[PDB]
Amino acid sequence: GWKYFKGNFYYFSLIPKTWYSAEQFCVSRNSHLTSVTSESEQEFLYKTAGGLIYWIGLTKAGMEGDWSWVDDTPFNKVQSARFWIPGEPNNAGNNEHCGNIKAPSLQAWNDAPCDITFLFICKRPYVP
Ligand SMILES: CC(=O)N[C@H]1[C@H](O[C@H]2[C@@H](O)[C@@H](CO)O[C@@H](O[C@H]3[C@H](O)[C@@H](O)[C@H](O)O[C@@H]3CO)[C@@H]2O)O[C@H](CO)[C@@H](O)[C@@H]1O
Numbered sequence: 029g030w031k032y033f034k035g036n037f038y039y040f041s042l043i044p045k046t047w048y049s050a051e052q053f054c055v056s057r058n059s060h061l062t063s064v065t066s067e068s069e070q071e072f073l074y075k076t077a078g079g080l081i082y083w084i085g086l087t088k089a090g091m092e093g094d095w096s097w098v099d100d101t102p103f104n105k106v107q108s109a110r111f112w113i114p115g116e117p118n119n120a121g122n123n124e125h126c127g128n129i130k131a132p133s134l135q136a137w138n139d140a141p142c143d144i145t146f147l148f149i150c151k152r153p154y155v156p
């Protein structure tokens with residue numbers, strides 16, 4: 029069920045999991061929760077998400093609680109500022125240290141508690 033898009037395969041899960049359990053699942057399938065590095069990729073993901081909520085690879089790292097990608101793609105605060113839902117990230121309840129795709133828009137991302145279960149998206153490079 030992996031969907032191909034610009035050099036990567038993507039798995040849109042059918043079963044919801046917490047952020048970390050989702051990441052463990054992706055890792056067991058030789059992948060990671062997806063990073064998002066372009067407008068075209070953001071568009072691919074939110075459109076494929078079809079209005080439902082999916083964990084992606086967004087999580088806090090380091091002392092300052094800066095956002096990061098679990099697949100180790102460097103997180104670009106400038107280029108990503110446009111990808112959040114207006115008002116996000118808001119660290120609502122001071123317990124929102126992971127990120128998902130929530131809205132079908134370029135402004136798609138919400139930070140939510142890592143322990144909430146949602147569907148999730150894995151990303152795996154195509155290597156020939
Ligand atoms: C945990 C989480 O996702 N928090 C985000 C927050 O989501 C809440 C928001 O969507 C509201 C909308 O009213 O609904 C909340 O869920 C409630 C259900 O709608 C309701 O049926 C049930 O009985 O109670 C639920 C909890 O009150 C949902 O958690 O949205 C904000 C932005 O507005 C985000 O910043 C939070 O991360």
Ligand SMILES: [Ca+2]
Pocket residue numbers: 116117118119120124138139140
């Ligand atoms: Ca939030």
